Design a protein around this ligand. Sequence first.
Ligand SMILES: [Ca+2]
Ligand SMILES: [Ca+2]
Ligand SMILES: [Ca+2]
Ligand SMILES: [Ca+2]
Lengths: 363, 363
Amino acid sequence: SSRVIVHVDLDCFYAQVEMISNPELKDKPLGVQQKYLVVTCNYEARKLGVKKLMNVRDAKEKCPQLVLVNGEDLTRYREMSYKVTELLEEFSPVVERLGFDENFVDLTEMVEKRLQQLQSDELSAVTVSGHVYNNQSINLLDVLHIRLLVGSQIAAEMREAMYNQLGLTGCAGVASNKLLAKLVSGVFKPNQQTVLLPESCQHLIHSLNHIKEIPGIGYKTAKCLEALGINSVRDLQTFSPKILEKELGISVAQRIQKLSFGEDNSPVILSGPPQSFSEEDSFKKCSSEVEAKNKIEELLASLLNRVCQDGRKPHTVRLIIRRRESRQCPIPSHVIQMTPMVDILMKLFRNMTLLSVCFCNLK
Amino acid sequence: SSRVIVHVDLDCFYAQVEMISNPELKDKPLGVQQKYLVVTCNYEARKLGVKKLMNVRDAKEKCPQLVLVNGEDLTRYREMSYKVTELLEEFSPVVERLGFDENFVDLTEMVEKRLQQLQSDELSAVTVSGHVYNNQSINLLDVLHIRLLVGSQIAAEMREAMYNQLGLTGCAGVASNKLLAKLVSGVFKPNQQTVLLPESCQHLIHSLNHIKEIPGIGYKTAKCLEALGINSVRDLQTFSPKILEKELGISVAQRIQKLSFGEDNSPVILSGPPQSFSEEDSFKKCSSEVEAKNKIEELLASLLNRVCQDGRKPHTVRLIIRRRESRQCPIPSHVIQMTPMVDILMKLFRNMTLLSVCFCNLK
DNA sequence: AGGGTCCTAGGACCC
DNA sequence: AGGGTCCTAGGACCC
Ligand SMILES: [Ca+2]
Ligand SMILES: [Ca+2]
Ligand SMILES: [Ca+2]
Ligand SMILES: [Ca+2]
């Protein structure tokens, strides 16, 4: 029932794609520009004082010597994301994606293969690759330790294979479940990998500086918790289970309190092909008229430049706004094998600072 | 783009299972008893004046010489249902179930195989099996006619294979989509099969005596339609498409009006294993106290006698009532590999003439 | 920002 | 009755 999971995380991802979509961006302070905000920055830009999601005013005032490229189209980032997943699936079929720049892999079949291609002295060579968290000694007699180094060497290959093949540097974190693997990967922040052996566990949850840093405890679940006298991870651990049941509910409170201890029971989900393809247009309360039309038309050009890909096609259409609301309905089947579409999306709008079109229910 | 679909329908199904679960029920007027109502009756019982869903008072007063068996457990009906689907999947992998006693099969690969294992004189033998609807002549030069007899012979085998193998008599209806196939199967009502060739189409939709008889036009969609001056199938055909769009919506009105003409674009859904396993307890406002507990406990005994089957197991639990409402939440994973369950279902009840427990999200 | 994800409670429907 | 089904609009979450 103990596992080995690894968690692979692409570095300043959108920007690292850019330094390969244009070699001249190397050793330059690069930021990626989305409306009037820098969405992410390469490690030259981050030490000149540019910060992720700090306005592009102060991006150019802490670093008026910053270079910028556009990030309002995602295409190159997304393609380069799926080559990452694809590459990791070459190591194991079960890979779970998480946004464009993280992935998990269950290594427990592949660790249990690699321990049965070792005679005695290959086992005596079972070292760590990368760092160990909280600089913990390894008792190479604890099979949980043994397995959690076999997985870390596997993690090295995934990272070097990403480099030698795809050209991406990225961090990896190995640990007995998706949660501790996700928190340990970020520890040694530039390009490297870190493995959480079992006794290090509590040292990684109490190192957090607010329960919002817990994977899965979000914006609303922090508000509720903070209005109960729960701020520290240990508050959330020691708090009454029943009172948590009945302010947050049975599904949340069982889940997030079990998180605070470092527990995560969920398996690695083979994401496979995506569920949906969608696009967004933010504006400063600009759309105030049925020129909602234009952005609906404009968002549907790219979407039809997308939902002809990967050999599948959509059956439902959804229009999302914040004048969130959504209206959806099935695409009339004769359209599935532009413009008549547009009037469908206006039937959804007329049925109701942002407009979005979304194509899902792919078959 | 024309297709051949067949629609197989088990006769007085629950009762026909009974006449095989007990041979002594042959040539007896059999009804199946659910609370104080006869849920269905074999064809001896139906000609003595017993009617499906007429109280078991008048069931025993139009036919005080009726024999009855219990139908408040479904098990034998369900097992015998899936042997039907299984048997039809042996003919084609893509079978769509519909309640316990109907199925569709797409025969368009198997018709297109069988027409390429015919030399000339086997093609000259391509007759109908069963009846033709509206007693229509067959121009054996129209390939749509040709294919819609090849499918009807296939339909014979499914029915005789059901008999010789499973022992069930049942009706079959073949037609170019799931809708006309479903309406034509019921035409010749005792055990037989009927095929709708293309020109017969309108003769089968206008033969209906209210738009509730259309597959998919239900209880609510009839109410709305009837409050617009729509009662006949031709009312619904000729009614304004836009006004239908904006009283019934874009997804309904596009769908059900296209139904009224005999059109159904939806493919045959390979149902595969079921999505959910659930159970129900009706009562005459009896549960009025936390003896809701008992029925929750009682419904969970059978459900755990069920959700250990077919090699899969549930991840979410749902409690349904009508004091519909439902509350669900994920089953804590340590329970997935009774009694602690019961308290979960009471956390759902306390969060709120019927009580039901439902296990789905099977993995 | 701009993408993604699943859950839920209800809504219709079928038999 | 007593089972089943999918859709939808929202709800949370992640990056
Ligand atoms: Ca980074
Ligand atoms: Ca978080
Ligand atoms: Ca019948
Ligand atoms: Ca109907």
